[PDB]
Amino acid sequence: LPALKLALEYIVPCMNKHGICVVDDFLGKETGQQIGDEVRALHDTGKFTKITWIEGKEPGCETIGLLMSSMDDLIRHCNGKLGSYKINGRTKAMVACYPGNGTGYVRHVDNPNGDGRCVTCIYYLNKDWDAKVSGGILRIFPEGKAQFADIEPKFDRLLFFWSDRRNPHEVQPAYATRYAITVWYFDADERARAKVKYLTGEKGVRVEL
Numbered sequence: 001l002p003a004l005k006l007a008l009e010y011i012v013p014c015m016n017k018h019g020i021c022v023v024d025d026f027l028g029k030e031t032g033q034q035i036g037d038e039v040r041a042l043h044d045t046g047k048f049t050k051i052t053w054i055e056g057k058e059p060g061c062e063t064i065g066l067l068m069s070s071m072d073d074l075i076r077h078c079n080g081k082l083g084s085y086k087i088n089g090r091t092k093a094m095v096a097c098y099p100g101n102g103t104g105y106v107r108h109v110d111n112p113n114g115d116g117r118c119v120t121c122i123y124y125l126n127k128d129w130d131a132k133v134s135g136g137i138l139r140i141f142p143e144g145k146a147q148f149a150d151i152e153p154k155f156d157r158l159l160f161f162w163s164d165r166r167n168p169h170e171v172q173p174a175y176a177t178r179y180a181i182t183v184w185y186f187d188a189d190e191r192a193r194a195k196v197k198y199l200t201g202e203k204g205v206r207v208e209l
């Protein structure tokens, strides 16, 4: 499926109706496990600062760059059709590792105070993942509805959801190494407002004395 067809037929319609969207088999087995290798390479060489921020052009991060390009393409076809949002940019790629010792992440909202991020995009890298045993379910609690969404961190799966208070979510305890890559997309207007009240942007960068 072309990017234009996945945006206009699956992602945008789904986002505007539910605000939670799952695209399985996004890149394919061969590209998927290439990313899996590059992600494991970040751990082997010990670049995990376990989260680490990747730009996509770094050596040995070519396929992660491909993923980021593929993600951008997809949003680029969505632009001006997602609510009343104008995506004007994104964060770098957050590569995250749940070590598999029974750690998870408590219920939270990604962007509760309007720091500019409107869409969370997550790519999962976990082959043959069975949540019944290994855990690691992402549970989203969509605002208003009397029901939750359960999302397995299934290999080669791409997830979109609104970053704001509409989508509180938790990562349940994981008993197996659990890998994901996240990018957040910025709305022009909210980002403009954010840059005015919060220590975000270029100005939010530490300088040494």
Ligand SMILES: Cc1nc(Cc2ccc(F)cc2)c(O)c(C(=O)NCC(=O)O)n1
Binding pocket: 050, 051, 096, 097, 098, 103, 104, 105, 108, 109, 110, 122, 137, 138, 153, 169, 171, 180
């Ligand atoms: C704001 C935030 N930050 C992190 C970074 C982090 C990773 C590991 C960790 F242990 C502690 C923090 C997240 O992972 C998530 C999230 O919703 N993840 C869903 C998923 O990966 O399915 N949200």
Ligand SMILES: [Fe+2]
Binding pocket: 108, 109, 110, 169
């Ligand atoms: Fe989150």
